[PDB]
Amino acid sequence: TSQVRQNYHQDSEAAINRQINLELYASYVYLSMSEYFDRDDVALKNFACYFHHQSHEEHEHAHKLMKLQEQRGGRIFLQDIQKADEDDWESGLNAMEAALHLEKNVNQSLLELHKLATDKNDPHLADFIETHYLNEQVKAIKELGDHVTNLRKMGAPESGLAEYLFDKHTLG
Amino acid sequence: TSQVRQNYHQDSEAAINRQINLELYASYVYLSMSEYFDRDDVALKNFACYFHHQSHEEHEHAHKLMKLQEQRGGRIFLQDIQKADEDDWESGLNAMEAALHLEKNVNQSLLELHKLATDKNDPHLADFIETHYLNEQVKAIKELGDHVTNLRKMGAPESGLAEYLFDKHTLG
Amino acid sequence: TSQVRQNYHQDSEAAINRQINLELYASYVYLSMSEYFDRDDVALKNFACYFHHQSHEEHEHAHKLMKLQEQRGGRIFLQDIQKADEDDWESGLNAMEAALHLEKNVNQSLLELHKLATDKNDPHLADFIETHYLNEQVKAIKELGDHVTNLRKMGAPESGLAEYLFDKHTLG
Amino acid sequence: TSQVRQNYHQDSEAAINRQINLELYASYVYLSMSEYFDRDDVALKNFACYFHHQSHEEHEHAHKLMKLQEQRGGRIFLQDIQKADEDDWESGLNAMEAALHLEKNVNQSLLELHKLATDKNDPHLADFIETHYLNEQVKAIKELGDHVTNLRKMGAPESGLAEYLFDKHTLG
Amino acid sequence: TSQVRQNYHQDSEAAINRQINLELYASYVYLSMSEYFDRDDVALKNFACYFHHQSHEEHEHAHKLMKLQEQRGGRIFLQDIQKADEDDWESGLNAMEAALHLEKNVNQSLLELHKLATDKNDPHLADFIETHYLNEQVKAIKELGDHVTNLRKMGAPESGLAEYLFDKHTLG
Amino acid sequence: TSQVRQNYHQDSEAAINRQINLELYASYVYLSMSEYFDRDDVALKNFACYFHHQSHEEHEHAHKLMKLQEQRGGRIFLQDIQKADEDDWESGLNAMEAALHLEKNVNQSLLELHKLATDKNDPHLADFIETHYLNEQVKAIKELGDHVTNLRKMGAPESGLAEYLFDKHTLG
Ligand SMILES: CC(=O)NCCNc1cccc2c(S(=O)(=O)O)cccc12
Ligand SMILES: CC(=O)NCCNc1cccc2c(S(=O)(=O)O)cccc12
Ligand SMILES: CC(=O)NCCNc1cccc2c(S(=O)(=O)O)cccc12
Ligand SMILES: CC(=O)NCCNc1cccc2c(S(=O)(=O)O)cccc12
Ligand SMILES: CC(=O)NCCNc1cccc2c(S(=O)(=O)O)cccc12
Ligand SMILES: CC(=O)NCCNc1cccc2c(S(=O)(=O)O)cccc12
Ligand SMILES: [Ca+2]
Ligand SMILES: [Ca+2]
Ligand SMILES: [Ca+2]
Ligand SMILES: [Ca+2]
Ligand SMILES: [Ca+2]
Ligand SMILES: [Ca+2]
Ligand SMILES: [Ca+2]
Ligand SMILES: [Ca+2]
Ligand SMILES: [Ca+2]
Ligand SMILES: [Ca+2]
Ligand SMILES: [Ca+2]
Ligand SMILES: [Ca+2]
Ligand SMILES: [Ca+2]
Ligand SMILES: [Ca+2]
Ligand SMILES: [Cu+2]
Ligand SMILES: [Cu+2]
Ligand SMILES: [Cu+2]
Ligand SMILES: [Cu+2]
Ligand SMILES: [Cu+2]
Ligand SMILES: [Cu+2]
Ligand SMILES: [Cu+2]
Ligand SMILES: [Cu+2]
Ligand SMILES: [Cu+2]
Ligand SMILES: [Cu+2]
Ligand SMILES: [Cu+2]
Ligand SMILES: [Cu+2]
Ligand SMILES: [Cu+2]
Ligand SMILES: [Cu+2]
């Protein structure tokens, strides 16, 4: 038991590990989306850059959690980063829709992590989730929501012109 | 026989000459495309600038080969630069499609030039092709591929609005 | 079959995918090492920074390969990033030794990738491996070799003073 | 018949096309001369640079004409760029003499183009020839004349020292 | 057997050593030429500077090879640097001719080194030779070729004025 | 007999040649030491840089002597640069000890060169040795002495920590 450990329940420790893996999974899904839009038969460069940026963001979210684990005296146990559910993301709108869905899932897990921290009277971990994750999630979900709305109204996916112009004007 | 000649087979020499002529031909095809888009009944200024730039690029590719020929002690024998297969390129998408096709043909010739250099154990010429041509070809083909994809999805050629906006947003 | 595909054998395509996964695995192993040295009962900050840097380097190596796959007209198929063989890296010297070992394994795979490219007469892929990977591997292996040597001579791992000073003077 | 066409006789249009091809031919001859002086058994670097510059100048002369054709509503029809009369230019003086001769021929064609424009009462085309070509030709011919004179007086071609020093002092 | 050694055949190792010695020999020959032109009865200062520069260039070529040897896990075994075939280089043209000859010999050895690397499936060593040596050799040989040509045409060696002016205008 | 020769005895001339060869030998020994410390099983980077610097210093010492030879009207006759007595320098301390020993030997030769110049009443050569060599030798010997002392007191060679820290703090 670590010299620095204080008020850090083994349930929280294990949940942080589960959360670390999910951020890496989120990161990985976005990496897959990113390369998809670089395919010569898709070729939406800004969609690619956007999702490549999201990928590195999710990585930072993982780093912060790993840091937290060692700051608290817990032990990091890493698990396989699972490949995404699809290799082919079909369209710009569909990728946004899958992204929105993924972010809500990460958010649900984070909310249960906060519940766990409240239940265990770990107020340092509660504030840590609120400060670095909860509003970041709310912002991400809303932005993805905004994108899905604009793509739908522009006539995507039955309009290839729509995805082209959105790539230029919103993501460019 | 040149004072500088070393390990330079007469088959390679002649193939370099054939390759020089092809770069000039590629350059010439692009020059034709370039002026086409400046026609008052076509008037796509950025398509014109793009193909005018491609023309001068193919010229540099020719210069590098001519330089190589004299560096190795071979003799340059120049042949007529043949006019392109068409005077009228029909549309933006069609020009891109013809360009992609042309670049693949130049690439095939370059790959056979590399085979010839491997077969003749000319490793200076092999590296010369790899370094200055092979990846340049791969990049060009992919970019042209990307363009053809975006034009097709935007509704070209049955959409004049599509070619207009692509000229503005991708080539502008 | 892609509009851009030329001279790109399905065996090479699949091998690039296998190589992509290995770079990500290498990246992941280094991430694990990085966080290990941030543990309060290890606390070697520069060892941590060094391995964190190696992690992002292996990521770039993966990006370049993914780019190559789509440049050539192949399709990226991503696989799970497997967790490392150990959660606890024991010591500075041991991590270096595991790193050297890992890099030699990545190098062996890259050499077989080059053999495959030679065998398939894909000279663009051969040069791609030589240019961006082979010397990077040779440099990495030698640097890791240098580190293992200095740590061993300093009296590691039976000297905690040795690992402390190496962290300060070589990695600082 | 073009929306922009006005006072532009089909004889002028065809003559512009013939002139375009000649500028490209002139450009091509100069390119041949340029590489000749880079041969290891010739090795006059400044003669090479001078003729390489002349080559690109003749290209601009072609561009201006192509521009003119489309400005006037004519249609560009490109023809093969014929290879030069010689692959081996023998000496510095001989290349200058061939260049002077070529320029006078281009000038004669331009003068007949002006006659055609006068005869057809196309004063825009007449001024276009006067403004951008006639004095450029007069300057070129005189400069080439000056060079041939100096080379002859210096003792070329029976003096290799003469061609060396002229390369250094006039073209350097 | 080194901790870093991988795919590095003992034949390649020994050939690198033989090549190291030759670069040093080349360096030494050039040093001899350099001082020769500083003799009061020769006194061609720029010929001296040119060959002094060549000497240090060949030294760098040796350094790069020594670096390569230790990067690969081979052991450097150094041999005597043999003195040149002549103490008296006779003339500027003769030194250039001896230099051209020497460089072709170094090039032949490098080409056999590449063959050895191909035969041993050492693609890191093959690329190393291509990248850092083969084109450097091609450039050197051609430059020396150019110099010998100009000196011969200027009337060297029966013209002391020729060697004087070449020293001033080409090497100055 | 040279136009510039004055008061320059053939014994001095020959001794300068013998001294030139020794500086080159010293240079060569240091080059060998330099690469030794870059071996992956030695890996003392600053020891390597120090000895690499010593190597180029001994080269300058050779240049100055060659210059002197031609300034005085003597003729340079170069001899083989002999390889060092050892390929493997064993340790940092041992290399310093071998270096100190070598420098004393060069110094002894220089002192006999001065004696020769005094005996031959060549006061230009005497001052040349005093000015450019004798104090440089005294400084070098003392510095090497200082290094050997510090290494011995630090516990080298039975302390690998000692050689590591000396590499960092004195040579870094
Ligand atoms: C096509 C493309 O990739 N465009 C750039 C998109 N933006 C980005 C991508 C990756 C990382 C980024 C980072 S960082 O996480 O590395 O700090 C910071 C800021 C922007 C980033
Ligand atoms: C309408 C139009 O022509 N726009 C400019 C397009 N870009 C270019 C065209 C021609 C040559 C270029 C060159 S260079 O080959 O001359 O160096 C370098 C960079 C850009 C170039
Ligand atoms: C303790 C710690 O992390 N220190 C910084 C170590 N260096 C680095 C770490 C991660 C990424 C780096 C990157 S980049 O891949 O992001 O471009 C570029 C340069 C250095 C990098
Ligand atoms: C050895 C050599 O080539 N030297 C340079 C000679 N000058 C030139 C050559 C080619 C094009 C030039 C151009 S432009 O047409 O590209 O604008 C403008 C100005 C000078 C130019
Ligand atoms: C008369 C005379 O010696 N003139 C200077 C000639 N050029 C040179 C000589 C030696 C070394 C040089 C180096 S370097 O190898 O030291 O980096 C770099 C650049 C030029 C160099
Ligand atoms: C690892 C390594 O090599 N580090 C640099 C060590 N210092 C030096 C090495 C070689 C030549 C030097 C020279 S000069 O002789 O080229 O002028 C001047 C100053 C320093 C020099
Ligand atoms: Ca996000
Ligand atoms: Ca799985
Ligand atoms: Ca191109
Ligand atoms: Ca024809
Ligand atoms: Ca690495
Ligand atoms: Ca697993
Ligand atoms: Ca290569
Ligand atoms: Ca002209
Ligand atoms: Ca013909
Ligand atoms: Ca050289
Ligand atoms: Ca001998
Ligand atoms: Ca010294
Ligand atoms: Ca010997
Ligand atoms: Ca004195
Ligand atoms: Cu990335
Ligand atoms: Cu996240
Ligand atoms: Cu717009
Ligand atoms: Cu142009
Ligand atoms: Cu090309
Ligand atoms: Cu990171
Ligand atoms: Cu890697
Ligand atoms: Cu210290
Ligand atoms: Cu050009
Ligand atoms: Cu012209
Ligand atoms: Cu020197
Ligand atoms: Cu060399
Ligand atoms: Cu050196
Ligand atoms: Cu010395």
GROMACS .gro file of N, CA and C in nm, chain D residues 47 92-94 96-97 146-157 159 162-164 166-167 171:
model
   75
  563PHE      N    1   2.735   2.913  -7.094
  563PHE     CA    2   2.669   2.891  -7.223
  563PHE      C    3   2.541   2.812  -7.201
  608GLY      N    4   3.066   2.659  -7.901
  608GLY     CA    5   2.999   2.780  -7.852
  608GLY      C    6   2.958   2.876  -7.962
  609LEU      N    7   3.053   2.907  -8.051
  609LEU     CA    8   3.030   2.996  -8.165
  609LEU      C    9   2.923   2.942  -8.258
  610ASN      N   10   2.931   2.813  -8.289
  610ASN     CA   11   2.834   2.749  -8.376
  610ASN      C   12   2.692   2.755  -8.320
  612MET      N   13   2.578   2.987  -8.110
  612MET     CA   14   2.539   3.127  -8.126
  612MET      C   15   2.494   3.154  -8.270
  613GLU      N   16   2.573   3.108  -8.367
  613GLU     CA   17   2.538   3.122  -8.509
  613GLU      C   18   2.405   3.055  -8.544
  662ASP      N   19   2.619   4.041  -8.158
  662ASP     CA   20   2.730   4.084  -8.073
  662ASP      C   21   2.814   3.967  -8.024
  663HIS      N   22   2.748   3.860  -7.980
  663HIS     CA   23   2.818   3.743  -7.928
  663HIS      C   24   2.902   3.673  -8.035
  664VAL      N   25   2.842   3.650  -8.152
  664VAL     CA   26   2.911   3.587  -8.265
  664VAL      C   27   3.035   3.669  -8.305
  665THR      N   28   3.020   3.801  -8.308
  665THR     CA   29   3.133   3.889  -8.337
  665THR      C   30   3.247   3.870  -8.236
  666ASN      N   31   3.218   3.882  -8.107
  666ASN     CA   32   3.321   3.866  -8.005
  666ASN      C   33   3.388   3.729  -8.007
  667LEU      N   34   3.310   3.623  -8.025
  667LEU     CA   35   3.368   3.489  -8.035
  667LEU      C   36   3.462   3.475  -8.154
  668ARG      N   37   3.418   3.522  -8.271
  668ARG     CA   38   3.502   3.521  -8.392
  668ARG      C   39   3.635   3.595  -8.372
  669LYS      N   40   3.629   3.717  -8.319
  669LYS     CA   41   3.749   3.799  -8.295
  669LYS      C   42   3.842   3.741  -8.189
  670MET      N   43   3.785   3.666  -8.094
  670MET     CA   44   3.865   3.607  -7.987
  670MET      C   45   3.945   3.486  -8.037
  671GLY      N   46   3.909   3.436  -8.156
  671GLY     CA   47   3.980   3.324  -8.217
  671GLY      C   48   3.905   3.192  -8.213
  672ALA      N   49   3.776   3.197  -8.181
  672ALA     CA   50   3.691   3.078  -8.183
  672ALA      C   51   3.653   3.042  -8.327
  673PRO      N   52   3.636   2.911  -8.356
  673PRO     CA   53   3.643   2.798  -8.263
  673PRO      C   54   3.781   2.730  -8.248
  675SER      N   55   4.026   2.827  -8.104
  675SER     CA   56   4.082   2.860  -7.973
  675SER      C   57   3.982   2.816  -7.867
  678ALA      N   58   3.949   3.088  -7.597
  678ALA     CA   59   3.853   3.192  -7.632
  678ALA      C   60   3.712   3.160  -7.581
  679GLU      N   61   3.663   3.040  -7.611
  679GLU     CA   62   3.530   3.000  -7.565
  679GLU      C   63   3.524   2.993  -7.412
  680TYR      N   64   3.631   2.945  -7.349
  680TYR     CA   65   3.639   2.943  -7.203
  680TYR      C   66   3.624   3.083  -7.144
  682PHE      N   67   3.513   3.366  -7.283
  682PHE     CA   68   3.387   3.430  -7.319
  682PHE      C   69   3.276   3.380  -7.227
  683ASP      N   70   3.280   3.250  -7.197
  683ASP     CA   71   3.187   3.189  -7.103
  683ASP      C   72   3.200   3.258  -6.967
  687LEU      N   73   2.916   3.581  -7.043
  687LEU     CA   74   2.799   3.504  -7.000
  687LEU      C   75   2.799   3.474  -6.850
   0.00000   0.00000   0.00000
